[PDB]
Amino acid sequence: LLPMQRYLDNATRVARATLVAELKRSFCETSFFLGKAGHRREAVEA
Amino acid sequence: HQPLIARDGPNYMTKIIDRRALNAAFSLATEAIALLTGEALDGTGIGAHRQLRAIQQLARNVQAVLGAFERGTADQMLHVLLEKAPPLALLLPMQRYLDNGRLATRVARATLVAELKRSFCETSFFLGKAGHRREAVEAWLVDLTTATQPSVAVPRLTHADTRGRPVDGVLVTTAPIKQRLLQSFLKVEDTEADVPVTYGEMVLNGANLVTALVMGKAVRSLDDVGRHLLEMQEEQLDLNRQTLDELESAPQTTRVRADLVSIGEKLVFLEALEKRIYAATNVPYPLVGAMDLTFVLPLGLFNPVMERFAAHAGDLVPAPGHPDPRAFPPRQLFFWGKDRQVLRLSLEHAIGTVCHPSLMNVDAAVGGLNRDPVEAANPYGAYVAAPAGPAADMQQLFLNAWGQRLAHGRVRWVAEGQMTPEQFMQPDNANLALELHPAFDFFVGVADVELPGGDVPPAGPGEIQATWRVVNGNLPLALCPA
Amino acid sequence: SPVALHHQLKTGLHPGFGFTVVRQDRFVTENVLFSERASEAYFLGQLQVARHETGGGVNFTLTQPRGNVDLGVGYTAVVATATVRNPVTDMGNLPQNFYLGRGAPPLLDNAAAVYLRNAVVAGNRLGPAQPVPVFGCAQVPRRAGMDHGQDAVCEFIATPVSTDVNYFRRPCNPRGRAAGGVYAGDKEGDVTALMYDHGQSDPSRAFAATANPWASQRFSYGDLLYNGAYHLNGASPVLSPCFKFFTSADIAAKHRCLERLIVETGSAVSTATAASDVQFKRPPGCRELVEDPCGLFQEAYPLTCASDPALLRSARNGEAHARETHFAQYLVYDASPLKGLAL
Amino acid sequence: DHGQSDPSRAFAATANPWASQRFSYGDLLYNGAYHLNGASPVLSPCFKF
């Protein structure tokens, strides 16, 4: 979602191709959050 | 007035008004005109209802275009303040340079470049590089608000608080940066500001033009052109006495909800503008910029003499009884891609620049190096003689005719054999300018001599020739060492 | 020979060359503005109603002409670069053809000039699908799909082997000699004296006159490939990234006032496009306001790069733990504005 | 199509000649359209690949 809300405000071929590099990266980092970085607080409250 | 200070020992600012025009359309339809005019009307209730579908089609288009000009003001002011503004990474040197001396020595200009280079590569993306700290960031926002000299004009009405303290600046950020700065780095001190509403007007003192027809040629009838000057110059006072008395009496300031953050010693409007204006329009938000960074990757180099070593005796060892693929001259490159890729870049990608037959396009170089008349050098290798006579006396023809030619000056190619590869590119030799191509020797030859012919060439001038380096071994030892 | 150098680069022989790869990247940023109490006077006019007709119906174009007055003695506005979004270009290896180009004399044997072209274009990401027409640009074949973003077009500048790597561990010029109009003095012919007089020394590294004899001097191998003055690659739409490094007519045309060159590289015009497929020269209409650090300094930046997969992995720890050199190997650690961004 | 390059890694046509091309050893084992292994109830995880 957070990669897609930054895309629905600018529709070329390359700008579609840079979604997939964000959709892969924002999944493999921030899939689960209260288990991975759940011990911090400043990352959670944002 | 330029500031001047007195020392021991022995203006008007004119600025060109930039100018742009804006555009918006409205398009009606064909049926939409026949109903507004009255051509497709009946006495029926349906025809009177069909006007409402078309009169309000105006009111949905009139507002969507007349409102599209106050959001054009918000657009254009961004696209100009982006063009006035140089980046911080090239200002923290310049404000230190203008405040210090403004001195026109070539040395100080040659030290600004050492400042503009280093302060770019260190403080480019400060919130990403060192955004995890706090004290370095709170000094960075002070570096925003103190890198600029306050401007000339004093406005008539000034933006203020509910308290009434005047505001001295405006920050414009994107939306995620504004959320980050309002949690831990800044404080909101006010919510509702005092903002002027009226625009500003003018006092017109313009050059006036008089055109009046006169019937007849009399004294009193030609003075009416003169009276018309002071009749119209009086009316410019009647306009200008109104425009001051309106601005005294007009409702000046209202109450506007907007975020107010103090940084350092002054108040600043903190503002993000991609929800009010650029929402649901197809415009790029102009504060989302871009970069151009060009990069250098060396494929097939070789280490110098004091760099051919290992960090330990057994650092990277192959299997016992197998050759070491490290000590060989490399031909590849590995680097990181965008999505964490171990990419590979080798010499076989360089086919398309070298196999193309423009590497043997030389005539643009031979026919232009012989523009200024080059002097005569030693033609020992610039010349080939046709053979004659018996072979036993062939060398005695050589040394007895070339005795004085072998002792004018130094032979070029033999003297290039004692060159350290750091000495070759120095301006010590006079043979930098004859090294231009990886496969063509460029030397000084003999004028107007077809080859081969004659034992001794005629004493004429020289010109730069070009012969194809046949094999890899004909590169000089300063460019591929032993 | 372009036949003989084909048989070695395929079969794994190293010849006596070394290329310095130059490519260009475009990074979407998030800037931060600042302005002042009255940094600009702003004038607006009166609306105009222009009527036009169309088979669909009558158009009402509306115009309002406006004005900008920059009343700042000194500097009154600041852009500040905060973070980095996606890189538009994929940092990849797109090798450049000159078979897309046109205007080079072919080798005279038609049996062999056709043989080289069918050996390089055939099976290439970039080479022309159809043979090049006599007018207009040749076309790049359409890829069926993209995953990472557009492809940074690499280059290959022929440099000698015995140059040191230490010229590349620092932000340097790929020409081998420091170009640029910032460095010149207040004479008439100083700018051309920087780039081509090789009786003097390099202003950047003063103990040597050049780093590449094959690219810095006039009529070198570097100039004959990549100039705006000779028009070798005038026909292909594919951008050459070192076009702004070598074309001496364009550096000599810029002025020298550092009060204005710093502002004019805050909103300079790029030489590439983002709506392209691989990477193109820009069409004459579009203007992408992209800030140019390479426009001022005529310098390019090094990458995290090595020549072993074994030796690259020492660089992911950081800076002081990465071994630089091996017996015949080397590392280049970056000196960029991307040093601590983990991009 | 293997005259074109892989959109993931653009400098090679594929990473498997025995799995990616049509009528490969990978296609003949794990396609629904050929039905080698639709009679057994045990899942093949590369059925969607």
Added chain:
Amino acid sequence: GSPRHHLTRQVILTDLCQPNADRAGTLLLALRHPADLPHLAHQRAPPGRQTERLGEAWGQLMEATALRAGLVSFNFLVAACAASYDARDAADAVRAHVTANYRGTRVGARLDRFSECLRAMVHTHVFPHEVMRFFGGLVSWVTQDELASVTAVCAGPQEAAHTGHPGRPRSAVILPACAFVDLDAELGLGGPGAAFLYLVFTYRQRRDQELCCVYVIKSQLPPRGLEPALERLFGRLRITNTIHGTEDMTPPAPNRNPDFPLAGLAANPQTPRCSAGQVTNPQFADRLYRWQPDLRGRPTARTCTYAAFAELGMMPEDSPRCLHRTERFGAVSVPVVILEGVVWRPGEWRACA
């Protein structure tokens, strides 16, 4: 303001065109009187083709519509040539409502017959761009037994002519999505500008393997500069016509013509000549050089045509607007390209030989 346009009325037999099934806003193409067809085939045909084919193929159509310069609607013409398009999924959708909505018995026996007429046109070499003439787009109709009164705009903007029903008075140009071929998107011209509309036929000349295609091409090119753009699309048809269009013409085997010697004869002053009165006398004309040129079976230009275009109109907008909707023609859903605000200007045809 109300723009100016021009209406036409014509009492038209409803065998080939149907103003009831094809709604208001389609193209109409008028013919020659079909007594001219079997004689022009007898005269304009290349040597060795069956001139007795056009007179028989048209005769099998009039005997199929009974179970006079008429009119063929565009939707009827597309479905007749439906076996030669690329998008066959939509080309069999245009045929799907031609056979199902047109009034009559066995409409599906006309399409296979009228296309056999068009294959007889290319073969008997009376090309239908010399026969199909532009007639205006539909605005209204009046129905009757076996005929109808058709109203159309021969020249002007389409959206100005009043339909007649005060519930929905206007008409937009309605086209099936099989014929509408852009040249803005496929070439890469995305810039704004007024666009021209063109009617384009294409042929293919082989022995009993011949085709027909009717296109409506929107482009930003002038009619003087369309031939480089038609060649880029249809160059496959250009090659197949130059080598296969010349068949049963008898060639000279082997060659009989030598090289042309005037560059060699005029250089030598020893060559015999003649005066103005000496020529056209057999005692002095036999002393000259004899030259018998043989042009037989050459692939001439009219036997190598692949396409033919004409002006059709323009869209004077800055950015011309097309649509892609699926309108219901009775019970059949059809891919439809809807043109917005077409200003009609006819023009003469132009072969692409």
Added chain:
Amino acid sequence: FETDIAIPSGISRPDAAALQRCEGRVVFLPTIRRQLTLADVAHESFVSPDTLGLLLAYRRRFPAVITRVLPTRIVACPLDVGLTHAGTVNLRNTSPVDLCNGDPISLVPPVFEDVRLDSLDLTLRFPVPLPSPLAREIVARLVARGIRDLGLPDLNVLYYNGSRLSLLALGPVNAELRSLVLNMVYSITEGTTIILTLIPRLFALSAQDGYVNALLQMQSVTRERRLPLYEALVAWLTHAGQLGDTLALAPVVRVCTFDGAAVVRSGDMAPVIRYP
């Protein structure tokens, strides 16, 4: 806009009846002007010119169709500047050819078959409004006849709208059309030898085998004493480029019928537009 061609006085009783018959007929004026004499209209102004001289003259002059005819002046409107303003001007056939709807109509000099005013001492030749696809035929048939005089019975047979035309119906038209025939033949015999000197091989190649493979090279885009040859190129391009305009017979008139018959027969009037 309407011009006025004033009849000079001295009109006899049959002479007013002859000008009464030319209601919907095409008239060439020199320049668009309000005041205009009848003597600039008539055939005396054309001097007698042949068919080539008329085809040149019908392009420098500006055609006009007569409206109502007053007893004092002829009121005509021109086809270039006065027809885009008004809607529709009626036009009468003088042709044996039936006009159909939607035809583009050019004009032909009166080749087939002369209102003469005896009191005024002038003749009047009027052009023939036949459609443009026949205009490139009827000229091309008759030029092809005159080459044979330096035939075939189908050459005189024209089928249009199911009606038979007979071009034969021969004597004076052969001598009338002579300067066309002398320019049509010459521009081909000069044309097909300069090609044959530049590329001399074009007849020696085998027809369907070698000549096609040399034709495909001409079609492709990717493949890139002295004979006074190159001064004869310029000599031919200006003469063949001259006959391209004169024998174009570009259409002035397009008929759009409204509330009438689809076929306008001989002698009847047809409605005419020239603008969208």
Added chain:
Amino acid sequence: MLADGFETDIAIPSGISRPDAAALQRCEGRVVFLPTIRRQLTLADVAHESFVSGGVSPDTLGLLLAYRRRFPAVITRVLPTRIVACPLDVGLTHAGTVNLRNTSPVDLCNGDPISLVPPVFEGQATDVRLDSLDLTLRFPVPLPSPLAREIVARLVARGIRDLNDLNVLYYNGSRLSLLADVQQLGPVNAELRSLVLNMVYSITEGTTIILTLIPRLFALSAQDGYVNALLQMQSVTREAAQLIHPEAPALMQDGERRLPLYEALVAWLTHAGQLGDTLALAPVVRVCTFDGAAVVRSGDMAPVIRYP
């Protein structure tokens, strides 16, 4: 209006000096090449800056080939903020009359079709250069059509020489010459192909009958003063008649039903008579002077109504 006229707005920038602003007002009746039919354009699009190919500014022959890929428009009024033009392919005006201006050294007459030609002549290469904007405006020369077929023939035949004088013209007894310059090899080959295609396509089986009339033309040239003034002193068919005696093939395949000369003439009119439009651009424009004078002098305006 939409049909009758079409007004474009070529915008003028902000910073223009008055030595530059007073040069545009002398450019009232000119010919301007728009690339599109947009209603808002800029001077950087009109000028020679946008005319360049990839890096190569082409010569006077390649200057032709990028005319006919564009849209000719005529300036109708120069305002201080914009220049208003009318593209000729759409429509003239409501009244259908737009005033041009002679840049030629050649007078015009009534009813002559105008084709436009580059500034080819000597003493004619007048480029209005704006110094503050770095803009040249290469205005073409409105010539009569029988001049415009000569000059294109003089330029195309000149490049055929250099692939292995002419530059002197005469019109109404006034001597005028055109400039000579080396030609770029690119656009010359684009002209030779448009010759030989439209030249070879005009050859039909029936043309071998017309070729047998060459001894009939030459024997007639000794009697008629029209044919003697026709052929030329430096023609080819005069030298083709004195050396070659052609004769026709006896029979034609299916020679009963087809007409050999009729197919030869129609194929000649559609390919070789069409040739003057395939090298240069089309004569859209002709002169209709109403009341002023039948001859329009150089430097004078002339009213214009469209030609097919």
